[PDB]
Design an enzyme around this catalytic site. Sequence first.
Site, PDB file in Angstrom:
ATOM      1  N   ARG A 240       0.765  -1.224   0.000  1.00  0.00           N
ATOM      2  CA  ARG A 240       0.000   0.000   0.000  1.00  0.00           C
ATOM      3  C   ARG A 240       0.794   1.271   0.000  1.00  0.00           C
ATOM      4  O   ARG A 240       0.438   2.306  -0.599  1.00  0.00           O
ATOM      5  CB  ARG A 240      -0.992  -0.037   1.194  1.00  0.00           C
ATOM      6  CG  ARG A 240      -2.099   1.038   0.987  1.00  0.00           C
ATOM      7  CD  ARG A 240      -3.112   0.950   2.071  1.00  0.00           C
ATOM      8  NE  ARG A 240      -3.966   2.137   2.184  1.00  0.00           N
ATOM      9  CZ  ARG A 240      -3.955   2.881   3.336  1.00  0.00           C
ATOM     10  NH1 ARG A 240      -3.416   2.587   4.560  1.00  0.00           N
ATOM     11  NH2 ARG A 240      -4.566   4.075   3.249  1.00  0.00           N
TER      12      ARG A 240
ATOM     13  N   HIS B  81       0.453   4.290  -2.563  1.00  0.00           N
ATOM     14  CA  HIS B  81       0.068   5.682  -2.205  1.00  0.00           C
ATOM     15  C   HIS B  81       1.162   6.702  -2.455  1.00  0.00           C
ATOM     16  O   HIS B  81       0.879   7.892  -2.749  1.00  0.00           O
ATOM     17  CB  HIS B  81      -0.310   5.733  -0.705  1.00  0.00           C
ATOM     18  CG  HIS B  81      -1.763   5.374  -0.497  1.00  0.00           C
ATOM     19  ND1 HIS B  81      -2.592   5.992   0.414  1.00  0.00           N
ATOM     20  CD2 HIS B  81      -2.503   4.451  -1.157  1.00  0.00           C
ATOM     21  CE1 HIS B  81      -3.818   5.512   0.247  1.00  0.00           C
ATOM     22  NE2 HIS B  81      -3.764   4.540  -0.619  1.00  0.00           N
TER      23      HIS B  81
ATOM     24  N   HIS C 120      -5.716  -6.104  -3.833  1.00  0.00           N
ATOM     25  CA  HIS C 120      -6.721  -6.192  -2.813  1.00  0.00           C
ATOM     26  C   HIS C 120      -6.883  -7.615  -2.293  1.00  0.00           C
ATOM     27  O   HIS C 120      -7.549  -7.735  -1.242  1.00  0.00           O
ATOM     28  CB  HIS C 120      -8.064  -5.449  -2.942  1.00  0.00           C
ATOM     29  CG  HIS C 120      -7.955  -3.977  -2.745  1.00  0.00           C
ATOM     30  ND1 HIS C 120      -8.832  -3.019  -3.175  1.00  0.00           N
ATOM     31  CD2 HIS C 120      -6.929  -3.270  -2.158  1.00  0.00           C
ATOM     32  CE1 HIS C 120      -8.375  -1.829  -2.823  1.00  0.00           C
ATOM     33  NE2 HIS C 120      -7.165  -1.939  -2.260  1.00  0.00           N
TER      34      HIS C 120
ATOM     35  N   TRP D  83     -10.519  -9.084   2.312  1.00  0.00           N
ATOM     36  CA  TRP D  83     -11.077  -9.372   1.002  1.00  0.00           C
ATOM     37  C   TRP D  83     -11.114 -10.847   0.798  1.00  0.00           C
ATOM     38  O   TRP D  83     -11.718 -11.282  -0.193  1.00  0.00           O
ATOM     39  CB  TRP D  83     -10.312  -8.711  -0.161  1.00  0.00           C
ATOM     40  CG  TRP D  83     -10.456  -7.237  -0.260  1.00  0.00           C
ATOM     41  CD1 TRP D  83     -11.379  -6.616  -1.025  1.00  0.00           C
ATOM     42  CD2 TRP D  83      -9.649  -6.197   0.326  1.00  0.00           C
ATOM     43  NE1 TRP D  83     -11.284  -5.252  -0.923  1.00  0.00           N
ATOM     44  CE2 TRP D  83     -10.199  -4.972  -0.141  1.00  0.00           C
ATOM     45  CE3 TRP D  83      -8.494  -6.205   1.105  1.00  0.00           C
ATOM     46  CZ2 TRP D  83      -9.656  -3.752   0.214  1.00  0.00           C
ATOM     47  CZ3 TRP D  83      -7.991  -4.966   1.513  1.00  0.00           C
ATOM     48  CH2 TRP D  83      -8.549  -3.760   1.054  1.00  0.00           C
TER      49      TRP D  83
HETATM   50  C1  HEM Z   1      -9.732   2.702  -6.575  1.00  0.00           C
HETATM   51  C2  HEM Z   1      -8.507   2.484  -6.056  1.00  0.00           C
HETATM   52  C3  HEM Z   1      -8.364   2.011  -4.591  1.00  0.00           C
HETATM   53  C4  HEM Z   1      -9.020   2.326  -3.496  1.00  0.00           C
HETATM   54  C5  HEM Z   1     -10.237   3.249  -3.347  1.00  0.00           C
HETATM   55  C6  HEM Z   1      -8.433   1.611  -2.396  1.00  0.00           C
HETATM   56  C7  HEM Z   1      -8.868   1.686  -1.079  1.00  0.00           C
HETATM   57  C8  HEM Z   1      -8.287   0.980  -0.038  1.00  0.00           C
HETATM   58  C9  HEM Z   1      -8.667   1.115   1.310  1.00  0.00           C
HETATM   59  C10 HEM Z   1      -9.783   2.059   1.820  1.00  0.00           C
HETATM   60  C11 HEM Z   1      -7.938   0.279   2.047  1.00  0.00           C
HETATM   61  C12 HEM Z   1      -7.917   0.061   3.572  1.00  0.00           C
HETATM   62  C13 HEM Z   1      -6.946   1.029   4.331  1.00  0.00           C
HETATM   63  C14 HEM Z   1      -7.036   0.632   5.759  1.00  0.00           C
HETATM   64  O1  HEM Z   1      -8.203   0.735   6.318  1.00  0.00           O
HETATM   65  O2  HEM Z   1      -6.182  -0.019   6.326  1.00  0.00           O
HETATM   66  C15 HEM Z   1      -6.990  -0.359   1.157  1.00  0.00           C
HETATM   67  C16 HEM Z   1      -6.037  -1.262   1.568  1.00  0.00           C
HETATM   68  C17 HEM Z   1      -5.075  -1.742   0.683  1.00  0.00           C
HETATM   69  N1  HEM Z   1      -4.896  -1.335  -0.612  1.00  0.00           N
HETATM   70 FE1  HEM Z   1      -6.198  -0.308  -1.793  1.00  0.00          FE
HETATM   71  N2  HEM Z   1      -7.264   0.983  -2.829  1.00  0.00           N
HETATM   72  C18 HEM Z   1      -7.281   1.118  -4.204  1.00  0.00           C
HETATM   73  C19 HEM Z   1      -6.307   0.675  -5.073  1.00  0.00           C
HETATM   74  C20 HEM Z   1      -5.220  -0.057  -4.659  1.00  0.00           C
HETATM   75  C21 HEM Z   1      -4.065  -0.386  -5.496  1.00  0.00           C
HETATM   76  C22 HEM Z   1      -3.980   0.142  -6.929  1.00  0.00           C
HETATM   77  C23 HEM Z   1      -3.249  -1.161  -4.775  1.00  0.00           C
HETATM   78  C24 HEM Z   1      -1.802  -1.605  -5.056  1.00  0.00           C
HETATM   79  C25 HEM Z   1      -1.229  -2.077  -6.099  1.00  0.00           C
HETATM   80  C26 HEM Z   1      -3.789  -1.218  -3.423  1.00  0.00           C
HETATM   81  C27 HEM Z   1      -3.320  -1.961  -2.380  1.00  0.00           C
HETATM   82  C28 HEM Z   1      -3.854  -2.107  -1.125  1.00  0.00           C
HETATM   83  C29 HEM Z   1      -3.383  -2.994  -0.107  1.00  0.00           C
HETATM   84  C30 HEM Z   1      -2.261  -4.045  -0.303  1.00  0.00           C
HETATM   85  C31 HEM Z   1      -4.188  -2.820   0.957  1.00  0.00           C
HETATM   86  C32 HEM Z   1      -4.088  -3.542   2.334  1.00  0.00           C
HETATM   87  C33 HEM Z   1      -3.398  -2.639   3.374  1.00  0.00           C
HETATM   88  C34 HEM Z   1      -3.349  -3.275   4.720  1.00  0.00           C
HETATM   89  O3  HEM Z   1      -3.551  -4.431   5.063  1.00  0.00           O
HETATM   90  O4  HEM Z   1      -2.777  -2.552   5.607  1.00  0.00           O
HETATM   91  N3  HEM Z   1      -5.022  -0.587  -3.391  1.00  0.00           N
HETATM   92  N4  HEM Z   1      -7.189   0.139  -0.124  1.00  0.00           N
HETATM   93  O   LIG Z   2      -5.066   1.739  -1.280  1.00  0.00           O
END
Ligand code: HEM
Ligand SMILES: [O]
Length: 293
Positions: free
Chosen positions: A47, A51, A174, A190
């Site tokens: 993440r 970001h 995700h 997920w």
């Molecule tokens: C429309 C685009 C996206 C949205 C709105 C989105 C939104 C989110 C949100 C809200 C979370 C949870 C944050 C938290 O509560 O801990 C999350 C977690 C995460 N996102 Fe996305 N994300 C998107 C695209 C992506 C992309 C493009 C990737 C990477 C290549 C990514 C990788 C991850 C990962 C690995 C997590 C898990 C983080 C954790 O366990 O701490 N996301 N994302």
């Molecule tokens: O994300």
Amino acid sequence: TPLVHVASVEKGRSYEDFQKVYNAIALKLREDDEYDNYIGYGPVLVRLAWHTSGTWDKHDNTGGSYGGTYRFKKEFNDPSNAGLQNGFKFLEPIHKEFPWISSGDLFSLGGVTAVQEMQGPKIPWRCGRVDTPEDTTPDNGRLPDADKDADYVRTFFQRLNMNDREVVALMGAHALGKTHLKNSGYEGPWGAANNVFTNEFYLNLLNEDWKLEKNDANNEQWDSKSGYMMLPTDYSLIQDPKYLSIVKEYANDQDKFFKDFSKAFEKLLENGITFPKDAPSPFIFKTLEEQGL
Ligand code: HEM
Ligand SMILES: [O]
């Protein structure tokens, strides 16, 4: 007056030097495995890479991975970056061990390492990002919202020069980690293998029975009987006809998914960066497993 961001290799460093850095992050990943209920730091590093790179604007070449600006308050404190301070902390010790690596390099490389170390595809990685001043930090507001539909996702990604296939490929990250209420106002994972890189995301979307529910934060999310969640933006991939076809393709071809994510992820991390013909070729890092470590 779009900016030019020319990569420059940290003075006199080569493959071997980066390989050590990958190894350090890798070994720390193995050791510090209790974080987030035994999820480990893998997902949070992915993440943090996204970001830091996802602030990019193709229009003026502002933001993106090059300047490692997440180290400045304005970026670090972006409400969209809530929770990422966990990944930042993890890497601090590493950065102290290898003070010559640029902040943009380290943030990018930590995403590469996590992916490979979680059994994901190999991601070719190029060094040379250079730390830029505090006044180069992008304003808050360039990362995507999660309560939107297909048309938003689609439009959002154009800013990063990502097409439908690249967007669908990218969202398959995700499969990793979970949403945390206190962070984003979303809650739950997920899927079941939260720290192994697979095409589980796509399988889950097509196969689970989702129910639109409202969580403790008053936000709607898709919930399954198995205990999984989908953000509105995840579910949007099976609502749009163009997305859904790619979703089905990655659910039926793990190899195709790996190959397309590797391409798109390397591309996300490289957007905005000019590499001279003189620059070394992208490195492919060996995992610990391949090193016998
Ligand atoms: C429309 C685009 C996206 C949205 C709105 C989105 C939104 C989110 C949100 C809200 C979370 C949870 C944050 C938290 O509560 O801990 C999350 C977690 C995460 N996102 Fe996305 N994300 C998107 C695209 C992506 C992309 C493009 C990737 C990477 C290549 C990514 C990788 C991850 C990962 C690995 C997590 C898990 C983080 C954790 O366990 O701490 N996301 N994302
Ligand atoms: O994300």
